[PDB]
């Protein structure tokens with residue numbers, strides 16, 4: 110209907126050319142106020158603090174994805190030069206001869222924010238390697254039939270964990286507590302995005318359909334989009350609102366905010382968004398980060414008072 | 419003497435607890451001042467007036483509390499971190515609501531555009547154009563640049579408030 114957001118600040122002329130897996134915010138330095146970390150296609154590793162650019166750094170290769178365990182960690186080829194506030198800290202490499210497709214995080218035990226963390230990686234060979242809370246070593250190597258296109262983790266490493274994996278073949282696979290399911294869901298097109306929601310996983314296939322899936326295989330709802338999917342992301346507001354939404358941006362230029370079946374906000378960036386991040390950046394908790402095809406950076410913020418009901 | 423109620427709101431980390439510490443006597447002052455938790459109530463004397471001062475927290479988590487004092491308050495001091503260009507809008511929203519409320523009477527609002535010393539500071543005319551203070555047409559208001567650390571301007575400000583509170 111209308112857009113719920115507050116317009117923070119806009120930089121039409123950032124250098125940034127990156128898509129979602131190469132964008133991230135974390136507290137690398139620890140002075141409370143969080144920083145935006147981007148693995149550009151410049152093979153340059155830009156860092157933004159607040160309204161301004163802080164650093165640039167040089168990246169050996171062109172990057173695949175960046176995560177954090179306060180230690181940033183770019184992936185590329187078969188190496189993962191995990192930096193750390195903010196200078197090289199390892200060059201851990203995959204035992205068999207492998208190329209990296211995807212990477213994400215897992216909670217170590219607390220299943221709560223700002224806790225101990227275990228890095229996770231998918232390999233073109235067909236494995237998902239979960240590692241140590243110091244990034245020390247492979248903790249569970251699970252070999253799985255298909256090439257992973259992208260992945261999502263819901264859970265805790267100690268308590269319980271379910272990981273959802275979208276393969277390039279157009280199938281959705283599941284792993285619960287290190288154990289691999291034989292439950293295989295067939296998609297309608299090859300997957301474009303994967304989001305961990307409340308009680309289900311969201312796939313976006315190329316035919317402009319978002320789909321909701323439960324670990325069992327039930328299809329909860331289906332979102333049918335007017336244009337093509339360029340971006341998807343878990344927007345997670347905690348507090349008395351407690352909703353775990355889905356933002357999806359399209360090439361026609363709109364950025365939509367579905368709350369389960371329902372649309373809650375739509376705004377349009379002048380150029381198509383390629384990257385979406387929702388989280389604490391700056392001192393404000395609910396903030397939306399967009400990197401567009403015009404290479405501009407846009408920061409928007411969710412009012413305390415906005416109802417997503 | 420005469421006592422009046424002053425509420426001090428503002429986003430987190432703007433220097434409300436610091437700005438009120440410079441109103442307290444040099445001996446009663448705290449050395450390292452801490453992130454206000456919940457809220458804190460000091461009394462400060464300046465002239466015929468004796469200020470009943472309310473220091474709120476600014477973190478989102480507690481903003482739900484500012485509404486608690488809007489009825490009794492006789493004046494509002496709104497503090498703004500000048501280096502935080504980012505969360506300028508978030509300040510505006512919180513300020514809009516505070517005015518909008520039905521319990522907040524049309525009292526004088528003194529705005530401190532604090533942290534003028536910081537290099538990247540936002541200048542008193544850009545700040546009040548973000549916050550849109552030019553629109554405020556029903557009450558006396560003034561923006562004053564400042565430095566909470568030092569007390570710089572804090573005099574220039576409270577003196578103003580005290581004037582229309584008399």
Ligand SMILES: Nc1nc2c(ncn2[C@@H]2O[C@H](COP(=O)(O)OP(=O)(O)OP(=O)(O)O)[C@@H](O)[C@H]2O)c(=O)[nH]1
Pocket residue numbers: 428429430431432433434435436437451452453454455474475476477497532533534535536564565566567568
């Ligand atoms: N450079 C500079 N730093 C300041 C100034 N005023 C406060 N600070 C620093 O800002 C930090 C937070 O100040 P506080 O006064 O506790 O923040 P607050 O306004 O009370 O808001 P709360 O988070 O609700 O307590 C501390 O490091 C202060 O030293 C200032 O005028 N200039």
Ligand SMILES: [Mg+2]
Pocket residue numbers: 434435436453454473474475476
């Ligand atoms: Mg305070």
